[PDB]
Design a protein around this ligand. Structure first.
Ligand SMILES: [Ca+2]
Ligand SMILES: [Ca+2]
Lengths: 576, 575
């Protein structure tokens, strides 16, 4: 289509982007490819104070002390295989966390550390009947009792686990121990199966060992059999936690292993729910599995390789596949630096021995593509309009900026069934993955509400102090703790000064009482490394030590009003 | 045209304030795409800036701060033209100034400015080159801010103007003033600097800060300040050695020009002939003829005689940029417009001639703060592009919840009518930006082993007998362990190493690839530790091995087809 969005025109879709090594999630407008917002997740965000405010530290829980992460796969909750706009889930590979973003407020509301695992890589959502579960893979291999004693160097004890999270509760429902490691994951359109690639079926501890096998596998998980095993008590608990771990190693009836060449990476469900495609990586192929054959693999009527219905050669380094609404597939070729457009039914005919061309087109991309994604492509609403390709090396595509270069997110018009590159988008910190949802499916709110759970503990603290946040400007003294409750209505804080003793632990609680959307305030204590966003009708709080004597100005750092520079007051720190 | 198609390059670099995010951003102009984020005052998960030992060294006395608010990014000049060497940037929130090296596009120096609170305006000396960087303390505090008798005694409170030696990155001197300070600029002669003041009242609340019908612009004579310093006419405060000069009203070092009303921006015209101070609460700007300043200093004329026009423009004038034709573009925050006006016509109208100085008002969306033209703060001003930094985007973009982006609007000014061409959503309210032609900036492609940015790490390795270009070694030092490893994609030079529970582990990684932008990373899983390791760079991080058992480290950057396999084990032995 046209990719130009002129002033006063709106984008058609939201993109929820991996922030990659930055630890954030980004909202893009499609097709303009402009970044509309950054949602802080695993990072310490100076702009909003996410990671330093008390409300955000509470959400981070057991990981509040961590300052970094690597945001991998962002995916939105579905009802009957269509996006429902409620949540976006995102994993941190670096510290094995999963977080949930509420789309009403576009902030992270839950975060959990997955036990018993190291490195959560693939993450997707259950599609059908709705996102009951979020699925994600432990990529690295570690002992279940990883205590630094006899298991430390004993590779025969090392395991990777597949993780099934209750999406609404944001708690791990169960884990499945597998043979090999795990890489990417996806779900069917029936609510019956989940499936993951494995690159280290060898359980190798160095690169050479991890690339010896001509075929690793896709492991398929039967949800029905897993739930039955759980109900029958056929699980183990490890590490003093209560997460049930099921045994899905070879020999189990919970899982089946389909051999796939070679150290495969992406695994992608076709939007008709008929097939999934596993991407060959070191083999110049993709492997196509017919989902309707999985029951026969589980019953032992056919062998796991009998579920493969095509295995077309495409090119060098296939990593990831996306789909249009017409039966075609778009596969990234990392080493050839192309997208291969191919037709699934023709690839099936060719696997059956028919002399038929399945390859439609190869498009040069710039350069070294990882994942690629189509508009609404992971749902039944796939529309065949846009393809976005996440290229890892931008080389000559942008002005030079030094020894660290941006990545290149390339937008391709696939609407004419003939692919045309229309935009090179420089991006920071190597987004891994993204998703594209039509604007009609996402409806954020304009104002916070006073009962929001995200600052409910801070409200409860105020109530214990006898403070009404909507009304009060009060200083509560609790020994060497000081709790300062202030209102803000642009261009004024509700207190012009307050006094504390040197060394006091000061918690400032600010409530923005403006009632107009977009009138964001901030609170910054100068020279203390403290700043935070205070959104309309929100309460936010930060705790710091008053370890600097004398006059210490606080101010509203956000431009909320013509007189915002004058929206400041003094913390007066008395000497001992 | 503002379209940059695939395989075409932008014409200019923009160096953008990251606002409350604490970073600096590099944009392509006119595409308005963000090419890079340079970490400064923030803790950058992508690169490890703020957690690596190299970056904490650079941060010095502020390595413990996790936040900042990056204000005014400006590039060094030679004879009033950008020279591409440095970009300087202030942190208002914690009173710091940092320097970015443009060869590697990383921050190389950072200092906390003493005796002050809240650095707002920052600009560079233009002529004969950027010898000095100039910046303002916005808030008013005692010089002996000890929490004793001065605490509530407002008569002790002061703001200081700060002159930094750009090449040394040390404060050269400070000038104490009456009133506070807001924005600043420099002439094109190397004679004068000048700052706005909104709190000439020394008010401690909003009402008190807006009582005066005129506050002022304070003009600093560089020659007189240098002479006073050499004569020993300075004081030191707070046990530091920064010389503070007395520029209060009546000093020979400064002159105070009355300007209505709580003014904000102050902007030098590209011919060096005028500066414009922006009226804010007064619907005017005040135009000063720079050549009159010597006569203000000698007493031949009085300070208000420096003003040659004070045209009414509209409600809330905040900031002025210039084309290459004698026109000015002033943001009107309250009217939500840009006013295009002609300086010489405004002077004629001030002198009673029946001439219209207002060329056009363009609606912007919405509530503009600063605005900037392409090469506009230099002699190379080309009159092609104007960017306007609007604070409220309202309905301009798809809705994203209670926090909305700002709107950076690109306007084609190359013809007689201003034409809006692009709305750019931006994060965290950029305060200010600059636009430099691509030909003036020439970054390098690879680091070199002698770079000062990791020299202390190299010197540590040398004390251990380690040659970083060759060695994969573990050094044991009591409860400290130093691990030196090479990386050549797709392999680290070690597949595993052993430590004891509770050891303080420093991992030093040197990337030996010789191809541009084959970036590696090092991440210690579940430890909150990750960093960029650029080609030919060394990077290091220190953490406690407080988790027993197998702890995988991996290359988080996609450096090779086999990057997922580029990983090894830290084996943490139980006690
Ligand atoms: Ca393998
Ligand atoms: Ca005033």
């Amino acid at each position: 289509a046209s990719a130009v969005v002129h002033p006063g025109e709106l984008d058609e879709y939201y993109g929820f982007w991996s922030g990659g090594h930055s630890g954030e999630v980004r909202i893009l407008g499609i097709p303009s490819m402009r970044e509309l917002m950054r949602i802080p997740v695993f990072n310490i965000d100076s702009a909003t104070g996410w990671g330093i405010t008390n409300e955000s530290k509470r959400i981070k829980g057991d990981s509040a002390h961590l300052m970094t992460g690597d945001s991998h796969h962002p995916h939105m909750s579905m009802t009957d295989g269509s996006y429902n706009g409620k949540y976006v889930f995102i994993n941190d590979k670096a510290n094995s966390r999963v977080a949930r973003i509420r789309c009403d407020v576009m902030k992270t509301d839950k975060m959990i550390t997955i036990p018993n695992v190291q490195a959560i890589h693939g993450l997707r959502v259950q599609k059908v009947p709705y996102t009951k579960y979020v699925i994600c893979n432990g990529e690295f291999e570690i002992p279940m009792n990883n205590d630094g004693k006899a298991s430390l160097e004993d590779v025969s004890t090392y395991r990777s686990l597949f993780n099934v999270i209750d999406a609404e509760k944001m708690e791990v429902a169960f884990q499945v121990m597998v043979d090999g490691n795990l890489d990417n994951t996806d779900a069917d359109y029936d609510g019956k199966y989940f499936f993951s690639t494995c690159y280290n079926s060898e359980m190798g501890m160095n690169l050479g060992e991890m690339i010896t096998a001509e075929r690793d596998h896709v492991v398929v998980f039967s949800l029905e059999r897993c739930l039955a095993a759980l109900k029958a008590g056929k699980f183990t608990n490890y590490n003093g936690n209560k997460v049930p771990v099921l045994d899905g190693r070879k020999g189990s009836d919970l899982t089946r292993y389909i051999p796939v060449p070679k150290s495969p990476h992406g695994i992608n469900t076709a939007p008709d729910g008929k097939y999934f495609v596993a991407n060959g990586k070191l083999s110049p192929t993709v492997s196509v599995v017919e989902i309707a054959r999985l029951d026969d693999v589980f019953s032992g009527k056919i062998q796991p390789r009998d579920a493969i219905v095509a295995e077309p050669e495409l090119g060098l380094g296939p990593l990831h596949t996306a789909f249009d609404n017409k039966g075609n597939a778009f596969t990234t070729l990392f080493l050839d630096s192309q997208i291969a457009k191919w037709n699934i039914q023709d690839a099936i005919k060719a696997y059956n021995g028919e002399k038929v061309n399945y390859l439609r087109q190869k498009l040069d991309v710039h350069y070294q593509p990882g994942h690629n994604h189509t508009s609404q492509g992971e749902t039944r609403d796939t529309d065949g309009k846009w393809l976005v390709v996440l290229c890892k090396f931008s080389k000559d595509r942008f002005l030079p900026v030094g020894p660290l270069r941006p990545e290149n997110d390339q937008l391709i018009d696939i609407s004419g069934d003939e692919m045309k590159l229309v935009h090179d988008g420089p991006t920071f910190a190597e987004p891994h993955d993204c998703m594209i949802v039509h604007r009609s499916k996402v409806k954020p709110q304009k104002l916070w509400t006073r009962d929001d759970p995200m600052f409910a503990d801070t409200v409860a603290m105020a109530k214990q102090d006898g403070v009404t946040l909507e009304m009060d400007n009060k200083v509560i003294r609790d020994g060497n703790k000081v709790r300062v409750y202030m209102t803000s209505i642009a261009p004024n804080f509700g207190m012009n000064e307050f006094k504390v003793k040197l060394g006091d632990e000061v918690t400032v609680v600010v409530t923005n009482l403006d009632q107009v959307e977009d009138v964001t305030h901030g609170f910054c204590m100068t020279n203390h490394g403290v700043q935070m966003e205070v959104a309309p009708q929100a309460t936010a709080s930060v705790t710091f030590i008053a370890n600097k004597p004398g006059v210490q100005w606080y101010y509203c750092n956000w431009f909320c009003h013509a007189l915002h520079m004058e929206m400041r007051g003094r913390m007066l720190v008395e000497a001992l």
